[PDB]
From Swiss-Prot, chain A:
Record protein name field: V-type ATP synthase subunit E
GO biological process per UniProt: proton motive force-driven plasma membrane ATP synthesis
CC terms in the record's Gene Ontology section: proton-transporting two-sector ATPase complex, catalytic domain
Family of this protein: Belongs to the V-ATPase E subunit family.
Organism: Thermus thermophilus (strain ATCC 27634 / DSM 579 / HB8)
Residue range from the parent sequence: 2 to 63 of 188
Example of a GO MF term: ATP binding
Name of the coding gene: atpE
């Protein structure tokens, strides 16, 4: 019957909202990582080069 | 993997650094031996004169 149909009618749109929330919750996890990984590695590239050149320079000073 | 990739950098960073700085020494030292010689060589010729001169002050 139709009564319980309204109970149906309520659930289906909620199934979709769990998903929409979820979708955003996977993506964000993904995106938090994207910037973070990229941003440290830059710094560690940077740092390693300087920690080299200045030595070689100081070596040139020898 | 941002740590890993950077780990891979580090190797090279120590190695290349080593190899070059160590190499720089070769170039300097082996040139130092040479350049030391070349101030000796400048003197060699006009050296005699120095002795002659120095001898002259001391002699009377």
């Amino acid at each position: 019957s139709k009564l319980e149909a309204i109970l149906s009618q309520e659930v289906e749109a909620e199934i979709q909202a769990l998903l929409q929330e979820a979708e955003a919750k996977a993506e964000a996890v993904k995106r938090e990582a994207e910037e973070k990984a990229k941003a440290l590695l830059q710094a560690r590239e940077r740092a390693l080069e300087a920690q080299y050149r200045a030595a070689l320079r100081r070596a040139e000073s020898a | 993997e941002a740590e890993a990739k950077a780990k891979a950098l580090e190797a090279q960073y120590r190695e290349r650094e080593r190899a070059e700085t160590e190499a720089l020494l070769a170039r300097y030292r082996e040139r130092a031996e040479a350049e030391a010689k070349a101030v000796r060589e400048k003197a060699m010729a006009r050296l005699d004169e120095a002795v002659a001169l120095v001898l002259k002050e001391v002699l009377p």
